[PDB]
Amino acid sequence: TGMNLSAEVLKHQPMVEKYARENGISEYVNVLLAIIQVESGGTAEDVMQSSESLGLPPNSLDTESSIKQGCKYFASLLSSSKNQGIDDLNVAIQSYNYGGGYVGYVAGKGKKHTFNLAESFAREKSGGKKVTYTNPIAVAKNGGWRWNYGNMFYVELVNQYLTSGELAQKVMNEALKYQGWKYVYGGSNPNTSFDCSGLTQWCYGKAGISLPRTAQAQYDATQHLPLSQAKAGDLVFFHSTYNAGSYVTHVGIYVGNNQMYHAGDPIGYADLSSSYWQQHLIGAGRVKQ
Ligand SMILES: [Cl-]
Ligand SMILES: [Cl-]
Ligand SMILES: [Cl-]
Ligand SMILES: [Cl-]
């Protein structure tokens, strides 16, 4: 059963892309963000829970050192895999939780990760000791338990977060170039940075849709619909966010699953389920195509 990454995790994406690039694993940014989600939900200082991989006490690293170490550690597990003749990504993902010894274990037993191999490795390392594990995946599989070592369901947990139209894709491919950028009032291009309506105008403009300059003018130019009927690529509008002369004071890009991408300070994803965003929500608007 597939799931969506939280805004708390997604805020770490520019930093994750930086260190993934430095370790030659830019194609695995999605896996690295799924690991953060599973490990800390993006709210712990050590976001990747990579302190133990550096032989340090739990939660010793700061956020930057955590992403640096997590990326470096995951890159070493992929290298260890390649060197032992393993092509399977799931071996590197399970070894993030189990340690590099799971690579060697799998290399001599078929070169592929299987739930049965993950289960046998944990059974050996635990000394045949069980512990309660009430995650619905474990409940449905064996009643709700695991062998007392690492997490034998780790691959499946990470792959829950690794499961939109053409307009949404073009708008977001442009918008994500400015993730973590400082909000600039009156900004409508990459040379000045952007404000909320400046970001939507530029990115939709790159997708071939001509939008007016203001959040209010953008609201007036769209077909309105409630957020419950909205899709990724629709705009989401807000009232009274600051002292302004118009009804609409803020605009964002709806990205589905009750979340948006906006400017935003820094520019990025926001969870719409917070009390604040619910109290300012007008609804959504569909652009003319
Ligand atoms: Cl046993
Ligand atoms: Cl037991
Ligand atoms: Cl803002
Ligand atoms: Cl329009």
Surrounding ion ligand 4 within 5 Å at CB are: 221, 287-288
Distance 264 CA to ligand 3 centre (A): 4
Distance 120 CA to ligand 1 centre (A): 10
Which ligand minimizes its atom distance to the CA of 123?
A: 1
246 vs 237: CA distance, rounded Å: 12
Give which of 184, 189, 168, 192 is closest to 261, Cα–Cα.
Answer: 168
Residue with tokens 């599989």: 141
Distance 18 CA to ligand 1 centre (A): 44
236 vs 8: CA distance, rounded Å: 20
**Cis ω for the linkage preceding 264 (within 30 of 0):** yes
Which ligand minimizes its atom distance to the CA of 264?
A: 3
Distance 252 CA to ligand 3 centre (A): 10
Which ligand minimizes its atom distance to the CA of 222?
A: 4
Find residue 237's DSSP bridge partners: 251, 283
Which ligand minimizes its atom distance to the CA of 204?
A: 4
Q: Where in the chain do CATH 3.90.1720.10 domains reside?
A: 164-289
For 115, other C-beta atoms within 10 Å of its C-beta total: 14
Distance 142 CA to ligand 3 centre (A): 47
Task: For CA atoms 78, 43, 163, 253, give the dihedral sign.
Answer: negative
CA 79 to chain centre: 24
Using DSSP, state whether 117 is helix, strand or coil: helix
Distance 138 CA to ligand 4 centre (A): 48
Residue type (1 letter), 113: H
Which ligand minimizes its atom distance to the CA of 195?
A: 3
Residue with tokens 């007036």: 220
Distance 260 CA to ligand 3 centre (A): 12
Distance 97 CA to ligand 2 centre (A): 21
25 vs 75: CA distance, rounded Å: 7
Distance 6 CA to ligand 4 centre (A): 29
Distance 149 CA to ligand 3 centre (A): 44
DSSP notation for 41-81: TT-SSSTT--SGGGT--TT-S-HHHHHHHHHHHHHHHHHHH
The CATH number of 4-163, from 3.30.9.10, 1.10.10.10, 1.10.530.10, 3.30.1490.20, is 1.10.530.10
260: phi then psi, degrees, rounded to nearest 5: -135, 165
CB neighbour class for 72 (10 Å; exposed up to 12, middle 13-18, buried from 19): middle
Residue type (1 letter), 188: S
50 vs 68: CA distance, rounded Å: 9
Cα→Cα distances 179→12, 15, 19, 186, 283, Å: 10, 10, 16, 18, 24
Q: Where in the chain do CATH 1.10.530.10 domains reside?
A: 4-163
Using DSSP, state whether 228 is helix, strand or coil: helix
Distance 159 CA to ligand 1 centre (A): 28
Distance 236 CA to ligand 4 centre (A): 14
**What is the CATH superfamily name and number for domain 164-289?**
endopeptidase domain like (from Nostoc punctiforme) (3.90.1720.10)
Find residue 250's DSSP bridge partners: 238
257 vs 203: CA distance, rounded Å: 21
DSSP notation for 140-205: HHHSSEEESSS-TTHHHHHGGG----HHHHHHHHHHGGGTTPPP-TT-EETTTEE-HHHHHHHHHH
Instruction: Write down the experimental method used for this entry.
Output: X-ray
Which ligand minimizes its atom distance to the CA of 277?
A: 3
Half-sphere exposure (Cβ direction) of 192: Cα atoms closer than 13 Å: 11
Using DSSP, state whether 256 is helix, strand or coil: coil
Exposure string over 248-287, b if 16+ CB within 10 A, otherwise e: bbbbbbbbeebbbbbbbeebbbbebeeeebeebbbbbbbb
Exposure string over 89-102, b if 16+ CB within 10 A, otherwise e: bbbbbbbbbbbbeb
Distance 126 CA to ligand 2 centre (A): 9
